[PDB]
Amino acid sequence: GLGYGSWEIDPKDLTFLKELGTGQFGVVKYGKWRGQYDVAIKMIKEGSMSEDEFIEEAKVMMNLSHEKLVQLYGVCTKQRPIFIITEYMANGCLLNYLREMRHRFQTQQLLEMCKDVCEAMEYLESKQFLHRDLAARNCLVNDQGVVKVSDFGLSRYVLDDEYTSSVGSKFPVRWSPPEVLMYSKFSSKSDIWAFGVLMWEIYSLGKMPYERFTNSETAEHIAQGLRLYRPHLASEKVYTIMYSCWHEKADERPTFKILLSNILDVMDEES
Ligand SMILES: Cc1cc2cn[nH]c2cc1-c1cccc2c(N)c(C(N)=O)nnc12
Numbered sequence: 001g002l003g004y005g006s007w008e009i010d011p012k013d014l015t016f017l018k019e020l021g022t023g024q025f026g027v028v029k030y031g032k033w034r035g036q037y038d039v040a041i042k043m044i045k046e047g048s049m050s051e052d053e054f055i056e057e058a059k060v061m062m063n064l065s066h067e068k069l070v071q072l073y074g075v076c077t078k079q080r081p082i083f084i085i086t087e088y089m090a091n092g093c094l095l096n097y098l099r100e101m102r103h104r105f106q107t108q109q110l111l112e113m114c115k116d117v118c119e120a121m122e123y124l125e126s127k128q129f130l131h132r133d134l135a136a137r138n139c140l141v142n143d144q145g146v147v148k149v150s151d152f153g154l155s156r157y158v159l160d161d162e163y164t165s166s167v168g169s170k171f172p173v174r175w176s177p178p179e180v181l182m183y184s185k186f187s188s189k190s191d192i193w194a195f196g197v198l199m200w201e202i203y204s205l206g207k208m209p210y211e212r213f214t215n216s217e218t219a220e221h222i223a224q225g226l227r228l229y230r231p232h233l234a235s236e237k238v239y240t241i242m243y244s245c246w247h248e249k250a251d252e253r254p255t256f257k258i259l260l261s262n263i264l265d266v267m268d269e270e271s
Contacts (some may be wrong), residue, residue, distance in 0.1 A: 007055075007062050009033070009074035009085050014041060021092060023137070023151075024158055024170075025049055030088055039073060042084035050157040051082055057153065058084075064127065068120035070140055070150040089140035089148065097141045098206035105205070107233055108271055113147045114199050115263050120149035121195060122256035125188055129153065132186065134194035135175045136201040173215040174208070179250055181219050189250035195259065196245025203231035203238065237266045 004010060015032040022028070026045030033039045044051070061072045076083035091097055094113070098105075117139060124131060131138075133155040140150045155163070162168040166181055177193035179185035197209050209228055210218040227246050230239040241262050247253045254262070 003078065007059050007074055008078075009076050009083070011076040011079065011083060014039070014076075014083075014085075016041065024160070024163060025154070033073070033085070038088040040086045040088045042086065044082045044084065046081060048159060049082075050159060051077075051080065054154075054157040055082075057156070061153070064124070064129065064152075066120055066123040068116045068146070068148050069123060069152070070148045086150070087148070088142075089150070090143040091141035091145065093137055094139035094141055094147055095136040095201070095206050098136060098202060098204075101205070107203075107235070107238075108267075109145075110202050110233060111238065111263065111267055111270075113202050115260070115267070116147040117149055117195065117198060118256055118260045118263055121191065122260050124149075124152060125191070125256045130186065130188065131191050131194070132156065133172055133175070134191055134198060135172060136198055136206060139198070169215075171215075173218055174210055177246075177250065178223050178248060181223065185250075187250060188255070189253045192245050192253045192256070192259070193250075195256070196242045197228070199234075199238070199242040199245075200228050200231060203234040203242075205233070207231075235266070235270060237270065241266065 013034050015035060017030045017032065020028045020030050020040060025042060025048050027043050029041045029043065031039050031041045055075060055077055058072065058075045065071060070089060071087040073085040075085065121131065129152065131149065131152045133151070138149070138151045139147050141147055158164055160170065163170040165171060166184060173181065175194040175197045177190050180190050200209060201207070210221065213221060225248060227243065241259065244254055
């Protein structure tokens, strides 16, 4: 206990159980903390992350807590193959979950997934905290089918320039508003735009946005004012909500509070 701050977990308290998946920072495993408590263990790949900057930020992140936000439990920082310890989400990433056709989702379930994400985002917005890479790949699903937002703010610590350059091979072009693509203008309203694309992913059962276009073509399409169109499973009212997130003028896009109200209105009207 001596060597440890309140944000610090002793890796010796971890039992490793199975691999859950991978991503920009490498592998995530399911484990137990002190033999009893389910955790996910993000095993940060050497050289992938600005670790000292992240660790400072982790202290701020420890204080972010909302039922629809994947909880940060702590960090293992005395090693430099460092670990991030988070809430365990048994059903994995939302993108893979949507793509499993066996679920045979009702549209009521799809709207609930949108509301789960919108609640987390309204909370982050109230803390003036940008996600910066909102997308289905960064949402997770627990054993109860509840969707939670994960990896919020972590793009700030990615060392791979292919991910951080707007013309990089790995930049999230398809989730970005014109002002991000054109002049790197990030704001609450770029999270709003990404949330609209996320609603589109959900109602499309995990199709890739602009699936027939390259990133370069997508950037041209959207800068010209053209947009994604209505997924078959989206009602007119649902489509109106997602489309509102894509106003060319950022200041004409809603807040997450307004989106949440609109989503609840639709739940009352079409459930
Ligand atoms: C969501 C995610 C992000 C990153 C970034 N680097 N490596 C990553 C791995 C994942 C990821 C993929 C698939 C499943 C999970 C998962 N079940 C959990 C979890 N907390 O249970 N966390 N991350 C996952």
